[PDB]
Every structure is written in C-alpha cells, then in structure tokens.
Amino acid sequence: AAVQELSIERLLEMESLVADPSEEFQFLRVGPDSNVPPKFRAPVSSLCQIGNKQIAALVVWARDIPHFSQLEMEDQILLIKGSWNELLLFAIAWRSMEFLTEETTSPPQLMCLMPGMTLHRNSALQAGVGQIFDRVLSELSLKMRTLRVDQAEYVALKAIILLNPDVKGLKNRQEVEVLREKMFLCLDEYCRRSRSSEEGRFAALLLRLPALRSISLKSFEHLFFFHLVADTSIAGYIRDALRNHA
Ligand SMILES: C/C=C/CC/C=C/CC/C=C/CCCCCCC(=O)OC[C@H](COP(=O)(O)OCCN)OC(=O)CCCCCCC/C=C/C/C=C/CCC
C-alpha cells in the first residue's frame, strides 16, 4: 500500500472489505432489566446480536479510515461512541431503498436490517416503535432514493458522520475538523465532476445529516426505555476493540 489518502476511491475500496469477524462486545442486549416479554426475548436478542456484529464491523472500518488511528486514542473512542448509532441507522436506510414501492403517501412496509432480513412495519408497530420506523423510511430512505444517492456519496457521508468535530469531550478537535474538511472537499469535487448538471447536490446531501442525528436521539430514547443498550460499558468495548485482539 502507498501512503493512504482520505479519498472517495479509498473509502469505496474499504466498503467492500470484509474482515474476519472481530470479537464482538455486547453494545446491544436483552438483559434482566429489559421489559421484553419472555416470548419475544429470543428474537429481540437475535436482533441485538445482528446489531453487535454490524457495530464490530464499524469499529474495524473506522480504525482503517486514513489518519484515524493517528488521532489520540481517547478521541477515537469518543468519535465511534458518538456515531455508531447514526451509522447503523444510515446503513439501514441505505439497504432499505430497494424495498421501497416503485415510484400517494402510503407508508413503506419493509425495513432492511441486513441482507435476507427485513423487519415488517407491523412488527415495529407492535413493539411500539412505529413512529421512528416511519421516520427512517421517509426522512432517510425515500429522500435518498429521490436524490439518487450513489455508493460514492454514501461512503463519503459515512466518513463525514464519523468524523464529527462537534462531539463533546474531544482533546484535539482541530485534528477532527481537518479530516472532516478533507471529506467535504472530496465530496464536493465528486459531485461537481460526476454530477455537474446538478447544482446544489453537495448541499442537498449534507441535509440528511441533521435528520440522521435527530432520528438517532429518538433511537436512544427507545433503547433506554427497553433497557437494550450497554450505555456505561460501551466506551470500554470500543477501547478494547481498538487495541484489537478480536
Ligand atoms: C438501531 C437499530 C439496531 C438494530 C436493531 C436492534 C435493536 C432491537 C430490536 C429492534 C427491532 C424493532 C422492533 C421489532 C421487535 C420484534 C419482536 C416483537 O414484535 O416484539 C413485540 C413486543 C411486544 O411486547 P409487549 O409490548 O409487552 O406486548 C405487545 C404485543 N402486542 O415488543 C417488545 O418486546 C419491545 C421490543 C423493543 C424493540 C426496541 C426498538 C429499538 C430502538 C429502535 C431503533 C430504530 C430502529 C427502527 C426499528 C423499527
């Protein structure tokens, strides 16, 4: 490999990589404090495990983002802790585009949690999370299909979501701002070259971020309500996952 650069091409190469499943930690879990009825505990636990695998993959991915490992370790941890939930929802929205009814405001009925696994709207309603389910499919999936967001833009936005200089607690915020600025320049360039006829495309893409942030906060409201998230242990899981060993 050559001195790696933070570029769209490199992020596309990284998106396809599949690393040996790193030992995963319990970010999400059905525990003794979870109000999930016995009859739904096995399936909810299975969903948490699917989530934990995707989070493990996210950690491996972040660690390989050009220059990320150069950041102070405690900052790496904060960036991942602050964006894992947004990144999971963003991926769910991206995968869910294919299940949207052909191009009237009938709510989409299927959410793609992973390949070969869809969550039907009725199950979401039954669990009490129909509102957020609809927000994910309308404010993210539908908007992205309408904007024809492509793979290059999707991976650029993922890097931008991760490299958030506004995360509270960072020791060297300027180092994160610089990386996010590198991505803004990369993305703007891509839009101008690959979609020159679409003025304002770059700005349109960035509008999906505040929506994702709002949806993520609502996601946490639910995870805390059902006691499905290992809040106080997460920083440690990331710390351990980063020094690898899994
Ligand atoms: C961020 C995404 C990461 C990946 C997902 C991992 C998180 C956990 C699972 C999320 C799946 C959505 C709900 C589907 C539940 C399936 C089982 C079911 O129907 O339970 C009904 C039960 C009726 O019980 P009962 O109420 O006692 O009895 C009622 C029977 N009528 O309901 C329950 O047991 C409550 C289940 C609580 C699920 C928490 C939602 C997690 C946060 C949402 C994040 C955004 C994702 C959008 C999903 C739509």
Coordinates of C-alpha atoms and ligand atoms in Angstrom, one line a residue:
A1 CA 0.0 0.0 0.0
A2 CA 1.0 3.6 -0.6
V3 CA 0.7 6.4 1.9
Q4 CA -3.1 6.2 2.3
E5 CA -5.1 9.3 1.4
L6 CA -8.6 10.1 2.6
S7 CA -10.4 9.9 -0.7
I8 CA -13.7 8.6 -2.3
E9 CA -11.7 5.9 -4.1
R10 CA -10.2 4.6 -0.9
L11 CA -13.5 4.7 1.0
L12 CA -15.1 2.6 -1.8
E13 CA -12.3 0.1 -1.5
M14 CA -12.9 -0.1 2.3
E15 CA -16.7 -0.5 1.9
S16 CA -16.2 -3.8 0.1
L17 CA -13.7 -5.2 2.5
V18 CA -14.9 -8.0 4.8
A19 CA -12.6 -8.6 7.8
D20 CA -12.5 -11.7 9.9
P21 CA -15.4 -11.1 12.4
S22 CA -13.6 -9.3 15.2
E23 CA -14.6 -10.5 18.7
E24 CA -17.8 -8.5 19.4
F25 CA -19.0 -6.8 22.6
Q26 CA -22.5 -6.5 23.9
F27 CA -23.4 -3.0 22.9
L28 CA -26.9 -4.2 22.5
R29 CA -28.5 -6.9 24.6
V30 CA -31.6 -8.2 26.3
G31 CA -30.7 -8.3 30.0
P32 CA -32.5 -8.8 33.3
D33 CA -33.6 -5.1 33.2
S34 CA -35.2 -5.5 29.7
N35 CA -39.0 -5.3 29.7
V36 CA -39.2 -7.6 26.6
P37 CA -41.8 -10.4 27.4
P38 CA -40.3 -13.9 27.6
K39 CA -41.9 -14.8 24.3
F40 CA -40.1 -12.1 22.4
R41 CA -36.7 -12.3 24.2
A42 CA -35.1 -14.7 21.7
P43 CA -36.0 -12.7 18.7
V44 CA -35.1 -9.3 20.2
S45 CA -31.8 -10.8 21.4
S46 CA -31.1 -12.1 17.9
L47 CA -31.7 -8.6 16.5
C48 CA -29.3 -7.2 19.2
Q49 CA -26.7 -9.7 18.1
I50 CA -27.1 -8.7 14.4
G51 CA -26.6 -5.1 15.6
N52 CA -23.5 -6.0 17.6
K53 CA -21.9 -7.7 14.6
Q54 CA -22.5 -4.6 12.5
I55 CA -21.0 -2.4 15.2
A56 CA -17.9 -4.6 15.4
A57 CA -17.5 -4.2 11.6
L58 CA -17.9 -0.4 12.1
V59 CA -15.1 -0.3 14.6
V60 CA -12.8 -2.2 12.2
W61 CA -13.8 0.2 9.4
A62 CA -13.2 3.3 11.5
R63 CA -9.8 2.1 12.6
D64 CA -8.8 1.8 8.9
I65 CA -10.0 5.3 7.8
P66 CA -6.9 7.1 6.7
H67 CA -5.4 9.1 9.6
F68 CA -8.0 7.9 12.1
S69 CA -5.5 5.8 14.1
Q70 CA -3.2 8.9 14.3
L71 CA -5.8 10.7 16.4
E72 CA -5.5 10.5 20.2
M73 CA -6.9 7.2 21.3
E74 CA -9.5 8.7 23.7
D75 CA -10.7 10.9 20.8
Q76 CA -11.0 7.8 18.5
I77 CA -13.2 6.3 21.2
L78 CA -15.4 9.3 21.5
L79 CA -15.9 9.6 17.8
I80 CA -17.0 6.0 17.5
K81 CA -19.1 6.1 20.6
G82 CA -20.9 9.2 19.3
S83 CA -21.6 7.9 15.8
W84 CA -22.2 4.1 15.9
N85 CA -26.0 4.5 16.3
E86 CA -26.2 7.1 13.5
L87 CA -24.1 4.9 11.2
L88 CA -26.2 1.8 11.9
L89 CA -29.4 3.8 11.1
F90 CA -27.8 5.2 8.0
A91 CA -26.9 1.7 6.7
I92 CA -30.4 0.5 7.4
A93 CA -31.8 3.4 5.4
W94 CA -29.4 2.7 2.5
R95 CA -30.3 -1.0 2.4
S96 CA -34.0 -0.2 2.7
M97 CA -34.1 1.8 -0.5
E98 CA -34.5 -1.4 -2.6
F99 CA -37.7 -2.4 -0.8
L100 CA -39.5 0.9 -1.5
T101 CA -42.5 0.6 -3.7
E102 CA -41.9 1.7 -7.3
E103 CA -42.2 5.4 -7.8
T104 CA -49.8 8.7 -2.7
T105 CA -48.0 8.6 0.6
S106 CA -48.7 5.1 1.8
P107 CA -46.0 4.3 4.4
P108 CA -43.3 1.8 3.2
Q109 CA -43.8 -1.5 4.9
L110 CA -40.3 -3.1 4.9
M111 CA -37.1 -2.2 6.6
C112 CA -33.8 -4.0 5.8
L113 CA -31.8 -4.7 8.9
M114 CA -29.3 -6.8 6.9
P115 CA -29.3 -8.9 3.6
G116 CA -32.0 -11.5 3.9
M117 CA -33.6 -9.9 7.0
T118 CA -36.4 -7.4 6.8
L119 CA -38.5 -6.0 9.6
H120 CA -42.1 -5.5 8.7
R121 CA -43.9 -2.3 9.8
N122 CA -46.5 -4.3 11.7
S123 CA -43.8 -5.7 14.0
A124 CA -42.5 -2.2 14.5
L125 CA -46.0 -1.1 15.4
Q126 CA -46.5 -3.9 17.8
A127 CA -43.2 -3.2 19.6
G128 CA -44.2 0.5 20.0
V129 CA -41.6 2.0 17.6
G130 CA -43.8 2.6 14.5
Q131 CA -43.1 6.3 14.5
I132 CA -39.3 6.0 14.3
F133 CA -39.7 3.2 11.7
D134 CA -41.6 5.6 9.5
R135 CA -39.1 8.4 10.0
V136 CA -36.2 6.2 9.0
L137 CA -38.0 5.1 5.8
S138 CA -39.4 8.5 4.9
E139 CA -36.7 11.0 6.0
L140 CA -33.8 8.9 5.1
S141 CA -34.5 6.0 2.7
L142 CA -37.1 7.7 0.5
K143 CA -35.2 11.0 0.4
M144 CA -32.0 9.2 -0.6
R145 CA -33.8 7.3 -3.4
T146 CA -35.3 10.5 -4.7
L147 CA -31.8 12.2 -4.6
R148 CA -30.3 9.1 -6.3
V149 CA -27.5 9.0 -3.8
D150 CA -24.9 6.6 -5.2
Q151 CA -22.3 4.4 -3.5
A152 CA -19.6 7.0 -3.7
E153 CA -21.7 9.6 -1.9
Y154 CA -22.9 7.1 0.6
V155 CA -19.4 6.1 1.8
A156 CA -18.3 9.8 1.8
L157 CA -21.3 10.7 4.0
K158 CA -20.4 7.7 6.3
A159 CA -16.9 9.1 6.8
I160 CA -18.4 12.6 7.5
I161 CA -20.8 11.2 10.1
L162 CA -17.9 9.5 11.9
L163 CA -15.5 12.5 11.7
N164 CA -17.7 14.9 13.7
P165 CA -15.7 17.6 15.4
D166 CA -18.7 18.6 17.5
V167 CA -18.6 15.5 19.7
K168 CA -18.2 16.8 23.2
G169 CA -15.0 15.9 25.1
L170 CA -12.5 15.7 22.2
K171 CA -8.9 16.5 23.2
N172 CA -7.8 17.6 19.7
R173 CA -10.9 18.9 18.0
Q174 CA -9.0 20.6 15.2
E175 CA -7.5 17.4 14.0
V176 CA -11.0 16.0 13.5
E177 CA -12.2 19.2 11.8
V178 CA -9.3 18.9 9.3
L179 CA -10.3 15.3 8.4
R180 CA -13.9 16.3 8.0
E181 CA -12.8 19.2 5.9
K182 CA -10.8 16.9 3.7
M183 CA -14.0 14.9 3.2
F184 CA -16.1 17.9 2.4
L185 CA -13.6 18.9 -0.3
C186 CA -13.6 15.3 -1.6
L187 CA -17.3 15.1 -1.8
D188 CA -17.9 18.5 -3.3
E189 CA -15.3 17.6 -6.0
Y190 CA -17.1 14.3 -6.7
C191 CA -20.5 15.9 -7.1
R192 CA -19.1 18.6 -9.5
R193 CA -17.3 16.1 -11.7
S194 CA -19.7 13.2 -11.6
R195 CA -23.0 15.2 -11.5
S196 CA -22.0 18.6 -12.8
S197 CA -25.6 19.2 -14.1
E198 CA -26.9 19.0 -10.6
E199 CA -26.2 22.3 -8.9
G200 CA -26.5 22.3 -5.1
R201 CA -26.2 18.5 -4.9
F202 CA -23.4 18.7 -2.3
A203 CA -25.6 20.9 -0.1
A204 CA -28.6 18.5 -0.6
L205 CA -26.6 15.5 0.6
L206 CA -25.4 17.3 3.7
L207 CA -29.1 18.0 4.7
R208 CA -29.5 14.3 5.5
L209 CA -27.2 14.6 8.4
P210 CA -29.2 16.7 10.9
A211 CA -32.2 14.3 10.2
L212 CA -30.0 11.3 11.0
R213 CA -28.8 13.0 14.2
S214 CA -32.4 13.6 15.3
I215 CA -33.5 10.1 14.5
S216 CA -30.5 8.7 16.4
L217 CA -31.6 10.6 19.5
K218 CA -35.0 9.1 19.2
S219 CA -33.4 5.6 18.7
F220 CA -31.7 6.1 22.1
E221 CA -34.9 7.1 23.8
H222 CA -36.2 3.6 22.8
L223 CA -33.1 1.7 23.6
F224 CA -33.1 3.2 27.1
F225 CA -36.8 2.6 27.6
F226 CA -36.5 -1.1 26.8
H227 CA -33.1 -1.3 28.5
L228 CA -31.4 -2.7 25.5
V229 CA -28.2 -0.7 25.4
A230 CA -25.0 -1.1 27.4
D231 CA -24.5 2.6 27.9
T232 CA -21.8 2.7 30.6
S233 CA -19.8 -0.2 29.1
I234 CA -19.6 1.0 25.5
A235 CA -16.5 3.3 25.8
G236 CA -14.6 0.2 27.2
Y237 CA -15.8 -2.1 24.5
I238 CA -14.5 0.4 21.9
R239 CA -11.2 0.9 23.8
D240 CA -10.7 -2.9 23.9
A241 CA -11.9 -3.4 20.3
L242 CA -9.5 -0.7 19.0
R243 CA -6.3 -2.2 20.6
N244 CA -7.8 -5.1 18.6
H245 CA -7.4 -8.6 19.9
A246 CA -10.6 -9.7 18.3
Ligands
LIG1 C1 -30.7 0.9 15.9 C2 -31.1 -0.4 15.1 C3 -30.2 -1.6 15.5 C4 -30.7 -3.0 15.1 C5 -31.9 -3.4 15.9 C6 -31.6 -3.9 17.3 C7 -32.4 -3.3 18.4 C8 -33.5 -4.1 19.0 C9 -34.7 -4.6 18.1 C10 -35.2 -3.5 17.1 C11 -36.3 -4.1 16.2 C12 -37.6 -3.3 16.1 C13 -38.8 -4.0 16.8 C14 -39.2 -5.4 16.4 C15 -39.5 -6.3 17.6 C16 -39.7 -7.7 17.1 C17 -40.4 -8.6 18.3 C18 -41.8 -8.0 18.6 O1 -42.7 -8.0 17.8 O2 -41.9 -7.7 19.9 C19 -43.2 -7.2 20.3 C20 -43.1 -6.9 21.7 C21 -44.4 -6.6 22.3 O3 -44.2 -6.5 23.7 P1 -45.4 -6.1 24.6 O4 -45.5 -4.6 24.2 O5 -45.1 -6.3 26.1 O6 -46.6 -6.8 24.1 C22 -47.3 -6.3 22.9 C23 -47.8 -7.3 22.0 N1 -48.9 -6.6 21.3 O7 -42.2 -5.7 21.8 C24 -41.2 -5.8 22.5 O8 -40.8 -6.8 23.1 C25 -40.4 -4.5 22.6 C26 -39.2 -4.6 21.6 C27 -38.4 -3.3 21.6 C28 -37.6 -3.1 20.4 C29 -36.8 -1.8 20.6 C30 -36.5 -0.9 19.5 C31 -35.1 -0.4 19.4 C32 -34.7 1.0 19.0 C33 -35.2 1.4 17.7 C34 -34.1 1.9 16.8 C35 -34.5 2.3 15.4 C36 -34.8 1.1 14.5 C37 -36.2 1.1 14.0 C38 -36.9 -0.2 14.2 C39 -38.4 -0.1 13.7

